[PDB]
Design a protein around this motif. Structure first.
Motif, PDB file in Angstrom:
ATOM      1  N   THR A 262       0.832  -1.189   0.000  1.00  8.91           N
ATOM      2  CA  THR A 262       0.000   0.000   0.000  1.00  8.91           C
ATOM      3  C   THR A 262       0.875   1.250   0.000  1.00  8.91           C
ATOM      4  N   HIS A 318      -4.151   0.413  -7.575  1.00  6.79           N
ATOM      5  CA  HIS A 318      -5.520   0.796  -7.254  1.00  6.79           C
ATOM      6  C   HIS A 318      -5.470   2.048  -6.393  1.00  6.79           C
ATOM      7  N   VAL A 319      -6.100   3.118  -6.863  1.00  6.89           N
ATOM      8  CA  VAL A 319      -6.043   4.423  -6.215  1.00  6.89           C
ATOM      9  C   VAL A 319      -7.395   4.710  -5.577  1.00  6.89           C
ATOM     10  N   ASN A 320      -7.378   5.034  -4.287  1.00  6.09           N
ATOM     11  CA  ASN A 320      -8.601   5.408  -3.596  1.00  6.09           C
ATOM     12  C   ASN A 320      -9.095   6.764  -4.091  1.00  6.09           C
ATOM     13  N   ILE A 321     -10.367   7.040  -3.830  1.00 10.04           N
ATOM     14  CA  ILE A 321     -10.946   8.333  -4.180  1.00 10.04           C
ATOM     15  C   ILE A 321     -10.290   9.385  -3.297  1.00 10.04           C
ATOM     16  N   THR A 323      -9.190  12.845  -1.214  1.00 15.52           N
ATOM     17  CA  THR A 323      -9.861  13.813  -0.365  1.00 15.52           C
ATOM     18  C   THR A 323      -8.988  15.056  -0.254  1.00 15.52           C
ATOM     19  N   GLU A 335      -3.984   7.858  -1.713  1.00 16.03           N
ATOM     20  CA  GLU A 335      -3.713   6.561  -1.112  1.00 16.03           C
ATOM     21  C   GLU A 335      -3.919   5.463  -2.149  1.00 16.03           C
ATOM     22  N   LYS A 337      -2.832   1.237  -3.588  1.00 16.78           N
ATOM     23  CA  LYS A 337      -2.465  -0.127  -3.234  1.00 16.78           C
ATOM     24  C   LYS A 337      -2.125  -0.888  -4.506  1.00 16.78           C
TER      25      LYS A 337
ATOM     26  N   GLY D  37     -14.976  18.261   3.145  1.00 18.21           N
ATOM     27  CA  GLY D  37     -14.443  17.143   2.394  1.00 18.21           C
ATOM     28  C   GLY D  37     -15.443  16.010   2.307  1.00 18.21           C
ATOM     29  N   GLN D  38     -14.962  14.896   1.759  1.00 23.81           N
ATOM     30  CA  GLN D  38     -15.774  13.699   1.599  1.00 23.81           C
ATOM     31  C   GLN D  38     -14.861  12.485   1.553  1.00 23.81           C
ATOM     32  N   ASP D  39     -15.143  11.500   2.396  1.00 29.61           N
ATOM     33  CA  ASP D  39     -14.350  10.284   2.482  1.00 29.61           C
ATOM     34  C   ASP D  39     -15.017   9.157   1.704  1.00 29.61           C
ATOM     35  N   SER D  40     -14.213   8.162   1.341  1.00 25.36           N
ATOM     36  CA  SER D  40     -14.673   7.025   0.559  1.00 25.36           C
ATOM     37  C   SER D  40     -14.376   5.731   1.306  1.00 25.36           C
ATOM     38  N   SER D  42     -13.818   1.444   1.160  1.00 24.98           N
ATOM     39  CA  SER D  42     -13.222   0.445   0.286  1.00 24.98           C
ATOM     40  C   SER D  42     -13.302  -0.909   0.980  1.00 24.98           C
ATOM     41  N   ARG D  60      -8.548  -4.684  -4.134  1.00 27.38           N
ATOM     42  CA  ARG D  60      -9.314  -3.598  -3.547  1.00 27.38           C
ATOM     43  C   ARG D  60     -10.486  -3.235  -4.447  1.00 27.38           C
ATOM     44  N   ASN D  62     -13.544  -0.157  -4.622  1.00 22.65           N
ATOM     45  CA  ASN D  62     -14.305   0.981  -4.136  1.00 22.65           C
ATOM     46  C   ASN D  62     -15.772   0.577  -4.092  1.00 22.65           C
ATOM     47  N   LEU D  65     -19.320   5.855  -1.117  1.00 23.66           N
ATOM     48  CA  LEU D  65     -18.832   7.155  -0.683  1.00 23.66           C
ATOM     49  C   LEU D  65     -19.584   7.572   0.569  1.00 23.66           C
TER      50      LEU D  65
END
Lengths: 464, 298, 140, 310, 298, 74, 139
Positions: A262, A318-321, A323, A335, A337, D37-40, D42, D60, D62, D65
């Motif tokens: 990661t 793999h890229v997280n959304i 913020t 972030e 992985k 902001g806004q978190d996601s 997984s 992983r 997604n 949201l």
């Protein structure tokens, strides 16, 4: 009659408990934050009565010993040794025990293996329930001790700008054993002044950190100047200890968990083209369950002249959304992985260390997997006899010229992109027919994944 | 509008024309329901999908109260209503059940704004409390025949439970020899009545409510938990052999349940610390089981 | 109403000729029970090819030899000689798989049965598809 | 090619996504602690085998949201506007969306409604599963963005003496959407210098804080000089997001929880008549399951001459 | 090799030769198994230890899907396949079951690399969804007769579920008078079919799969949970008495289940805040139960 | 208990069909339970990652089931 | 049933090796499966032991085929003690996990063949697997 200071500790990494030589044991240059030990479990048996004059007494039993914990930090210090003339990192067996579960073989192609150009670590052969087995030897002042049958649990690398490139190792061992007699002479096995000078010649500064990120689903490379980050190589190794009521027990064997690669990358928001803002907006606009990004974090920077560098490559990441991190200057966090193409395929990512990286070397490391194997940089496609056009019902077997002339993969594929007036085969023998009065194109791309483009606009006419 | 909170309630038991407001109530649980006769008349002519359900009876309610011990000892009336004979402040378990039918009483569950639920034809069917290292509390269980909603009610302004009794450690004796290493003494008393359903064809098109019941049996029981302790090798006093008849008393500073002759069965568990468990019931010819209620200063 | 199974994966053995035969049978569901009569393969020819990839421009590893065994019984055999097996073995992927190092991916194959005649319509039909694997052998 | 600084952020509160005018949008004067902001979410799918040569690989996905988080602090700044000559607080629509779930009507008698004497907020009409719906517009330097369909979750007010009267807002939105084009000219909608002078004329200082507490069961008013305190208006709003395995999801709707108006008030013990000691002793001597007190916390103090107060 | 992840799957239901790919699927659960005949022939000659087990039948599979509501209302086909008659976008519960056998369909569970599991002879046996303060979702339950592994399959590229419908608070009415203090409205619909096992001696040495089934009954049911609220002393509208026939509707912004005449049974729980619970079923002569499916703007 | 793994399309070795008789051995470095002929029944669970579950019993005419106990070095 | 061609051979050091294959043809149409043995006519078996599967691998040894009792189907595959020694010479020094006496020596497979029994070379592989040398102590 003496007190022992932490500053006089010296750490040696071994694969054998006897016959210690320079190929089985080397000193590991550790820092202040070194720590090791072993904790024990216990239990209290208490009687819990309810009547008057109750019994108020306890009793303790030692029942088990936990797995030994050790950790230390080392500098990423690639260099070339005089004996073999191959680039090698001093703590290379640590990288091997992290990477693969087979016997160390620097001449091979899996795990930790070196070359005349760079030192490389890939995780293509880590499908083992018990990775390569080490023995950490600790020398504090005069007394000796060691941890028996260690395993590299993880390796933390913190990209902290305005600081030197450093890696933090962690792991577990079956039992910490204090040794009264010297196992091997630390004067001989320990690194001498010549190799110390060679090492200190090469340092990796986290400030000069360029990052190369590309969306494989859209072919969009971004220009993201990093602010700070970190990536981890984790094995999730758990040590098993037996439960015996009559006698205390120490762990007997282990089992590796799920290999995770990661990361986390912080950067400021940029309004420029292909900046951080564009990446963030694209990622939050697509809203896709899976992403295919190519990430190549290059510690130490890229330069035309030779410079030290440590490179992490994630082919299918793999890229997280992302913020937005509201600070005095707005920023973001990427972030990621590194996931494999298939679960049992390995190849989640690899690393390349060397004190001599020209830009071409790191480029062909990224696109070919090895710093020595050259990779194609540009292509101009050539026809059969310097022909500029074609008429109806005429063949055109086109060829290719590539640069550099020493690229390992000199072949290309063939395709038609714009217009419908001709067809091409695997070899390149373009064929047309009648009623073809439009301008058609031809394209070629290499099979090494470089991303090289070969284009030509042939003006096919109806003929005279 | 008016919501109904459990914490804002008052439970009054109506017996003999006097209201026994049972304060010091830790928690109570109750439910009301109806019985239906739902049949589906699927025929070769019409394989129907709609059932023929009519509500014809009220399912008996099962009300459970958890009541703290109090200095005025109103809670001993639950033993009194359940069938025990009274002499002074001590309740006897009679050798034979006195009457065929139990002692019936009504109960109110008052709430604000003249809201109430009226349980009728109730009887005390279970009373058990655990003398332990926590504050003792007796969970009573009553069964109703008919429940109803009424506007005005009976509220026990005077007859009420006083202050809760302070905790005191339990102790179990044989004659006057203490039994060592007590863990939890749990006592249980029951009046296992049964409803006599007399729903007949004269109640068709009407809602039926149970009215009469008969006592199948009364009993007094206790389960004692100890730690397996032995003072001698081959001890005779403390062992695992059954005891056909032995005088036992589970004593406290405010209550003392006496078994003039007891039948004890033992059970050993090889847990973290060995525990033995007794099963105390009175013998065939034993004298009536005593339950003393000491308010203060015995 | 049920599904077909056009996707079939073949496994060949190195240094050994591979022989696969297909029988085409007419079927019907009626008042009388399932009546099956073999399809007469007259003017019916087969042709199959193997490439290392699905994408256009893939290298042709080899091609299958086609023959008809019995028209009356509706049996056609699709196979390749041992030399073709060796050719495909040479061109296979070098990536091994643990728990069975023998099998290696060779590519993708398709089979079209066609009936070409002056009075016959120019109709083709992809009877099967799938991937070709190789069981590496040491003998020979 | 530019970096964006937090100091240049400007916040506008709107009830409409189009047709922005001075009655639907106003700027909200925020402070340094602004955040959004806004978190996601997984998930990692890992194979857990037991044999030798096990598979060690992860993957992983997604999956969803989370609801957008926003928060900022503003000064309580009552004043009278020249247009209507009625006392109004600049962030009045925030108070309305906190108070009631109906359309804003300052002429009415429920929620946020003003007068020629004072601006008032009552919670007599908050029985709604979805309170008044806002849209927070964020302007950082040049780029625009906004949070879609926000709801005022709570409003923290900290009575911190030797400090100015301030309120902290928090809430959630369905989704944070970055806008490339300007929704409305911030120069016109933003507050001008005249109203800025009028506002800065009126500030509420937490030091001058008198408290009026009275036991309704005994008719006993106490004289308690405060040391520090806080009170909250909380809605306990929870945002619902659908679970779909094939595609990521954003919250779709919300539901208000239980409206809580709590507080906490610290003060020194006073031996004088009707002091803190008397209140403490009465409260620990009665030991009643329910209390009926009248509490009137007056920020800014009470005076014969005109003074600002909340 | 190829592992099979649940998140990387696609469920396509094959009916009438068209593939209904049911996207917006929150979660599904399924299992496959075989039936064995294991007997141990211990004799006086040989007291054997090894059983005589032969696999002769496929145990019917029980597949459960949890599907979010969608704007294209493909999920109403589950009511359509389960037996309800259709007029426009509203589904009626017929007075009588139309046919003896249910509506049979096949189902695929697609995965990567041409991997699939083929459930055949399926029928929708249960559909229930709870209108509550969370996003509504209907859990359907289908039973299969034969499961199989196939290479190529049917994939519903076009017929798919749209975007999930936004949440909207439920509300239950009597005619047009709202019922106050709703907590959770749960609706249940069933087609309680039964497999007709016809395993005979001609199937010896073969694997048997269930093929035909008959409908025992269809029904529509709903359980409504309220808070015990009363507006008057001795109220007539809100009480605990049963209601033989009363028009009820559990309405939402996107769905409305209508009982033209309902049989309501009430149940009171004396919990922290008193709760009453309804048991709504249609009466004997009630008109067909309505289920409307409004996509957008009713 | 296994994970549902297939190497080919329409694989014959790994599938859900029952196996009337097949030699099986559950081997370790210190113990090995041997079924000379086994009756295997399979059960697939559509969990987070598909899992197949076997039910191994010896057949009617199978040879005696072996249980070896290796202390050290087999 | 299915396929079970993969079986590993453990040959002993310093001892000659001989394997006895009872070829058989079981058919499960009738519940007591037919015990008919195949008849060994025009049959020859060939097998080589080659380290690793990569092309050009050196031939460690070669099996010696014996065909005896053709009527009842049995057959023998063997190799002399000299072949055993040649195999043990090239075996890897790493020992098997389950048995600390075995060492991987290579791979193998035997191929049946019909030579123009019907003018057809119907040759197919019988079995396969890995060959393991078991270190002896006697010599």
């Amino acid at each position: 009659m003496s007190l022992q200071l932490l500053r006089n500790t010296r750490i040696f990494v071994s694969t054998v408990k006897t016959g210690h030589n320079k190929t089985n044991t080397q000193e590991i240059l550790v820092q202040d934050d070194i720590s090791w030990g072993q904790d024990s479990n216990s239990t209290d048996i208490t009687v819990n009565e309810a009547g008057p004059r109750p019994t108020r007494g306890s009793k303790r039993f030692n029942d088990s010993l936990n797995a030994a914990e050790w950790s230390f930090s080392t500098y990423i210090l690639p260099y070339k040794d005089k004996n073999t003339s191959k680039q090698i990192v001093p703590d290379y067996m640590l990288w091997h025990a992290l990477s693969s579960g087979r016997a160390i073989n620097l001449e091979g192609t899996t795990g930790a293996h070196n070359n005349a150009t760079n030192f490389m670590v890939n995780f293509k052969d880590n499908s083992y329930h018990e990775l390569a087995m080490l023995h950490i030897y600790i020398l504090t002042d005069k007394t000796w001790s060691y941890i028996d049958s260690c395993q590299i649990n993880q390796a933390e690398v913190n990209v902290d700008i305005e600081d030197i490139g450093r890696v933090t190792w962690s792991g577990n061992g079956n039992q910490l054993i204090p040794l009264d007699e010297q196992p091997f002479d630390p004067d001989q096995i320990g690194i001498d002044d010549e190799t110390y000078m060679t090492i200190q010649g090469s340092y990796i500064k986290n400030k000069l950190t360029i990052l190369k990120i590309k969306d494989m689903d859209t072919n969009k490379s971004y220009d993201i100047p990093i602010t700070g980050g970190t990536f981890t190589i984790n094995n999730n190794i758990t040590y098993l200890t037996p439960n015996v009521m009559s006698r205390v027990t120490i762990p007997i064997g282990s089992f590796t968990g799920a290999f995770e690669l990661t990361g986390s990358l912080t950067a400021y928001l940029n309004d420029k083209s292909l900046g951080s803002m564009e990446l963030y907006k694209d990622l939050i606009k697509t809203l896709k369950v899976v992403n295919r990004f190519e990430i190549a974090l290059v510690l130490g920077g890229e330069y035309d002249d030779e410079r030290p560098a440590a490179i992490l490559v994630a082919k299918q990441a793999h890229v997280n959304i992302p913020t937005i991190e509201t600070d005095d200057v707005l920023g973001t966090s990427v972030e990621f992985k590194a996931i494999p193409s298939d679960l049992d395929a390995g190849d989640e990512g690899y690393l390349g260390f060397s004190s001599k990286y020209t830009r071409t070397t790191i480029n062909n490391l990224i696109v070919n997997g090895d710093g020595a194997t050259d990779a194609v940089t540009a292509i101009t496609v050539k026809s059969a006899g310097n022909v500029t056009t074609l008429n109806r019902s005429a063949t055109l077997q086109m060829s290719v010229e590539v640069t550099p002339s020493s690229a390992r993969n000199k072949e290309v594929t063939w395709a038609i992109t714009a217009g419908d007036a001709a067809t091409i085969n695997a070899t390149g023998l373009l064929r047309a027919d009648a009623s073809k009065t439009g301008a058609v194109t031809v394209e070629a791309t290499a099979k090494d994944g470089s991303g090289v483009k070969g284009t030509k606009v042939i003006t096919v006419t109806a003929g005279g | 509008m008016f919501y109904s909170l459990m914490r804002e309630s008052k439970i009054v038991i109506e017996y003999d024309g006097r209201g026994y407001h049972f304060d010091a109530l830790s928690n109570y649980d109750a439910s009301t329901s109806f019985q239906e006769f739902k049949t589906l008349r699927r025929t070769i002519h019409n394989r129907t999908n709609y059932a023929d359900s009519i509500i014809n009876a009220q399912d008996p309610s099962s009300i459970s109260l958890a009541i703290n011990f109090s200095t005025t000892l109103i809670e001993s009336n639950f033993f009194d209503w359940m069938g025990f004979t009274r002499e002074g402040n001590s309740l006897f378990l009679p050798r034979n059940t006195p009457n065929i039918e139990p002692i019936m009483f009504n109960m109110y569950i008052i709430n604000h704004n003249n809201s109430c639920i009226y349980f009728e034809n109730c009887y005390v069917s279970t009373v058990d409390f655990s003398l332990d290292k926590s504050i003792p509390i007796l969970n009573v269980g009553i069964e109703s025949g008919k429940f109803s909603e009424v506007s005005t009610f009976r509220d026990g302004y005077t007859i009420t439970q006083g202050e809760v009794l302070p905790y005191s450690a339990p102790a179990v004796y044989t004659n006057s020899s203490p039994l060592p290493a007590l863990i939890s003494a749990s006592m249980s008393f029951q009046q296992q009545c049964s409803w006599r359903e007399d729903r007949n064809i004269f109640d068709i098109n009407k809602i039926y409510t149970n009215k009469r019941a008969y006592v199948n049996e009364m009993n007094a029981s206790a389960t004692l938990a100890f730690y397996y302790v032995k003072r001698l090798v081959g001890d005779k006093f403390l062992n695992l052999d059954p005891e056909t008849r032995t005088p036992l008393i589970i004593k406290n500073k405010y209550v003392s349940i006496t078994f003039p002759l007891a039948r004890i069965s033992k059970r050993l568990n090889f847990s973290d610390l060995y525990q033995v468990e007794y099963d105390v019931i009175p013998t065939a010819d034993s004298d009536p089981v005593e339950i003393n209620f000491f308010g203060e200063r015995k | 109403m049920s599904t077909e199974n056009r996707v079939i994966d073949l496994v060949v053995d190195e240094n050994v000729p591979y022989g696969l035969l297909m029988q085409f049978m007419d079927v019907d569901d009626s008042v009388y029970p399932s009546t099956s009569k073999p399809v007469d393969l007259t003017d019916f020819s087969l042709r199959g090819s193997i490439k290392s990839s699905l994408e256009d421009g893939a290298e042709t590893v080899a091609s299958f030899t086609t023959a008809i065994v019995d028209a009356a019984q509706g049996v056609a055999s699709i196979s390749l000689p041992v030399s073709a097996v060796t050719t495909i073995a040479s061109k296979a992927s070098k990536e091994r798989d643990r728990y069975n190092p023998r099998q290696r991916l060779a590519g993708y194959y398709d089979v079209i049965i066609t009936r070409t005649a002056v009075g016959s319509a120019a109709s083709s039909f992809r009877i099967m598809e799938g991937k070709v694997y190789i069981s590496d052998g040491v003998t020979q």
